[PDB]
């Protein structure tokens, strides 16, 4: 009943850059500390012949203030000793766009309709995650079958993040 140890967190076994690759739409997230992709988020995963996996993600951000920049991001995933776990180096096509390198755990997915990721920016004294952010990607921006939500529900509680998700909107800003 205790819990909330990043390592305790249970991720999807036998991930598949392949089967996962493609278009994905952000339905929900969890805002880490700092600035962060605000509205209209959409990612595109796609692994190559050598097996390396990279991605792009158009999303809006209120950089500065009154400054609403739909940002075109990109990040290269270095593989880790776990098909599911990853470390994401990234940056924006445009130069002033926040560059960075964070972790990336494909928490869970069923590949065809939903996807849940977690990323622990920074660790806690014991093992909790302080700076932490997440997403709930769907293959269909038109929404998600309850079954999926229902499942998503699980995961979140598992990520010690229940409720804490601000739902994303898709007005087509970009």
């Amino acid at each position: 009943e205790r819990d909330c140890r990043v390592s305790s967190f249970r991720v999807k076994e036998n991930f598949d850059k392949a089967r996962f690759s493609g278009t994905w739409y952000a339905m929900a997230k969890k805002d880490p500390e700092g600035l962060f992709l605000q509205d209209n988020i959409v990612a595109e995963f796609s692994v190559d012949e050598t097996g390396q996996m990279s991605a792009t993600a158009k999303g809006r951000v209120r950089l500065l203030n009154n400054w609403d920049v739909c940002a075109d991001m990109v990040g290269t995933f270095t593989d880790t000793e776990d098909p599911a776990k990853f470390k994401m180096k990234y940056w924006g096509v445009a130069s002033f766009l926040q560059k960075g390198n964070d972790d990336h755990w494909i928490v869970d997915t069923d590949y065809d309709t939903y996807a849940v990721q977690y990323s622990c920016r920074l660790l806690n004294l014991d093992g909790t995650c302080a700076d932490s952010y997440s997403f709930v990607f769907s293959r269909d921006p038109n929404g998600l079958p309850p079954e999926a939500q229902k499942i998503v529900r699980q995961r979140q509680e598992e990520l010690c993040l229940a409720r804490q998700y601000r739902l994303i909107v898709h007005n087509g800003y970009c």
Epitope: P146, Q164, L167
Partner: antibody
Framework: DVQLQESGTVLARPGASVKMSCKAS????????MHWIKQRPGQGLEWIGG????????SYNQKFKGKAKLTAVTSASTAYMELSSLTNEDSAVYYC???????????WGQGTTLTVSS | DIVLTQSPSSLAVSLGQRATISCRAS??????????MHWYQQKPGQPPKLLIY???NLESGIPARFSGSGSRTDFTLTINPVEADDVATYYC?????????FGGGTKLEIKR
């Protein structure tokens, strides 16, 4: 944009029963809840309960468990709340508001006034 | 349930200064690392208007005037610079524990 309409005023006799509507329009009726709030004059705001159209699931507040029966037609995109064996107290304005599948407070409906006299 | 109590019930201040509406709790409203408190603006002859979600995160549509704060069992809605058209009743509400509950609200009036 997120439209949320309600039914016209209600007038009912002491002990009778009533049902209200709340059509959804502009968002996935199944990806949200939709709660019913009760506001009496020199009183305030009391949550009643909410429905998960998709799971047809339901959450009530023990203070109303035996007073409001909630339902919802996905296809019709409307949630309902039924007020049973009325008194003079249940008479108040009931509001309908949608709610996230994870948090809690967002859109409110015009609110249907409700009188329970004779 | 948990108790929400609105500090002063009537609230007056001059146009252009700050407001400090309160809302203490019987239990703690914070959990797993956050705070589930919320603020609404209920004007005459109308239904509530969401202002602040999670005692800190502002709602898209609401101006900088507002701003929340708190933790454990002490939170506060900040209205500044109070503006003429902000004359209303402010209710807080929590959703950290079932059943949901609101506050006794507070009527904000302007000094003129």
């Amino acid at each position: 944009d997120v439209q949320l309409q309600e039914s016209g005023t209600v007038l009912a006799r002491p002990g009778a029963s009533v049902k209200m509507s709340c059509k959804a329009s502009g968002y996935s009726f199944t990806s949200y809840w939709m709660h019913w709030i009760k506001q009496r004059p020199g009183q305030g705001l009391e949550w009643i309960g909410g429905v998960y159209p998709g799971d047809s699931h339901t959450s009530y507040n023990q203070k109303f468990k035996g007073k409001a029966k909630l339902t919802a037609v996905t296809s019709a995109s409307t949630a309902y709340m039924e007020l049973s064996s009325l008194t003079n107290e249940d008479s108040a304005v009931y509001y309908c508001t949608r709610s996230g599948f994870d948090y809690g407070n967002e859109d409110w409906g015009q609110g249907t006034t409700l009188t329970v006299s004779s | 349930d948990i108790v929400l109590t609105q500090s002063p019930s009537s609230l007056a201040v001059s146009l252009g200064q700050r407001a400090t509406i309160s809302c203490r709790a019987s239990e703690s409203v914070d959990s797993y690392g956050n705070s589930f408190m919320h603020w609404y603006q209920q004007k005459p002859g109308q239904p509530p208007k969401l202002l602040i979600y999670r005692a800190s995160n502002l709602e898209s549509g609401i101006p900088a005037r507002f701003s929340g704060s708190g933790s454990r069992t002490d939170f506060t809605l900040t209205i500044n610079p109070v503006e003429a058209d902000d004359v209303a009743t402010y209710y807080c509400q929590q959703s950290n524990e079932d059943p949901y509950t609101f506050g006794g609200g507070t009527k904000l009036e302007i000094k003129r």
